[PDB]
Amino acid sequence: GEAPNQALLRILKETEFKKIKVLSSGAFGTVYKGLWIPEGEKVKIPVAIKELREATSPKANKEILDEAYVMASVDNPHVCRLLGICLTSTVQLITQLMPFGCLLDYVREHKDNIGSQYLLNWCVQIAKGMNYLEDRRLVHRDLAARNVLVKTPQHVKITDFGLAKLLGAEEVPIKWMALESILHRIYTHQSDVWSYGVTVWELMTFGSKPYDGIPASEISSILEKGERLPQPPICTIDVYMIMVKCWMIDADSRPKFRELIIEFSKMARDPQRYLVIQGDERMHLLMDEEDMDDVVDADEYLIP
Ligand SMILES: Nc1ncnc2c1ncn2[C@@H]1O[C@H](COP(=O)(O)OP(=O)(O)NP(=O)(O)O)[C@@H](O)[C@H]1O
Ligand SMILES: [Mg+2]
Numbered sequence: 671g672e673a674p675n676q677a678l679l680r681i682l683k684e685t686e687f688k689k690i691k692v693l694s695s696g697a698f699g700t701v702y703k704g705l706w707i708p709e710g711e712k713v714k715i716p717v718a719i720k721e722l723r724e725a726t727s728p729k730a731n732k733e734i735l736d737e738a739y740v741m742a743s744v745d746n747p748h749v750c751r752l753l754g755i756c757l758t759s760t761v762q763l764i765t766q767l768m769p770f771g772c773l774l775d776y777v778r779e780h781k782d783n784i785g786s787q788y789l790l791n792w793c794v795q796i797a798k799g800m801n802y803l804e805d806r807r808l809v810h811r812d813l814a815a816r817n818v819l820v821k822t823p824q825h826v827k828i829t830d831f832g833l834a835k836l837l838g839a840e841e842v843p844i845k846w847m848a849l850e851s852i853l854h855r856i857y858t859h860q861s862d863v864w865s866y867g868v869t870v871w872e873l874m875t876f877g878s879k880p881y882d883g884i885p886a887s888e889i890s891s892i893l894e895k896g897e898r899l900p901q902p903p904i905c906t907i908d909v910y911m912i913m914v915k916c917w918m919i920d921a922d923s924r925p926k927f928r929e930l931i932i933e934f935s936k937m938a939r940d941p942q943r944y945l946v947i948q949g950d951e952r953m954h955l956l957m958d959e960e961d962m963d964d965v966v967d968a969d970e971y972l973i974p
Pocket of ligand 1: 694
């Protein structure tokens with residue numbers, strides 16, 4: 671059945687890293703851009719540091735350790751990298767810096783510069799990340815474009831594991847949830863597929879809000895009626911049909927992530943045949959400071 675989990679959790683000295691700038695604040699906590707110098711190693715690693723609200727209420731500490739636990743246990747090019755934790759008054763989470771931020775803000779900001787090749791490659795990459803999670807039997811439960819990060823315009827990774835669970839275990843983003851999850855709190859790899867559909871639609875509409883202005887309470891009814899998100903203007907029926915499949919009532923009738931990898935990948939070989947974007951053919955998409963000889967991306971920093 672279940673193999674032992676031998677992932678290493680790395681605990682990092684507060685002195686090994688400098689904060690440098692705030693990236694995001696308010697709500698629950700703060701995320702900083704920083705550099706990490708492991709002890710005596712002659713490398714500087716750009717990182718994000720997730721130190722929650724100074725309020726150290728035990729409830730919050732247990733949630734961040736759940737994240738660390740999940741992120742320490744994954745290892746895939748399309749899933750966010752945990753570097754370690756820092757155990758100061760409140761627990762800091764240290765991840766690979768994803769310089770271009772979250773994919774939702776990135777599509778919203780760069781609408782006029784995003785071609786079909788990038789859209790379809792992101793779909794392929796997110797499907798790969800999700801398939802890997804499926805191999806490790808994790809159900810993410812919060813896939814959305816706000817939970818995908820951008821290392822470069824050509825390289826994205828799934829983030830936010832603070833609701834992830836194993837398939838089976840029993841232990842609220844309404845507009846991204848499969849109907850069986852809104853109704854019965856059932857969560858499967860196939861409910862993740864539903865959310866993949868929504869995430870794709872967010873990308874294809876360059877950041878629109880699904881069911882914009884429709885209160886959450888209505889959502890389950892609308893879905894039961896048989897209503898779904900509408901076809902984005904740039905989408906051929908080929909792409910939109912993939913979305914709609916991800917939104918079938920019968921969970922087992924939805925595609926598997928491995929099929930999504932395959933379909934989007936065929937599409938990515940001829941992107942203009944599948945997404946129709948004004949000016950596509952002409953679209954195109956310088957690091958830290960001065961002492962940057964020793965900088966190494968996390969993806970090139972490997973640990974025995
Ligand atoms: N590894 C990272 N690299 C760069 N920016 C990041 C990173 N992690 C988080 N951020 C920034 O911080 C924002 C919020 O991070 P995150 O902690 O995921 O959001 P939150 O609202 O605190 N809760 P959630 O989004 O549900 O995790 C993201 O949209 C990014 O803009
Ligand atoms: Mg969170």
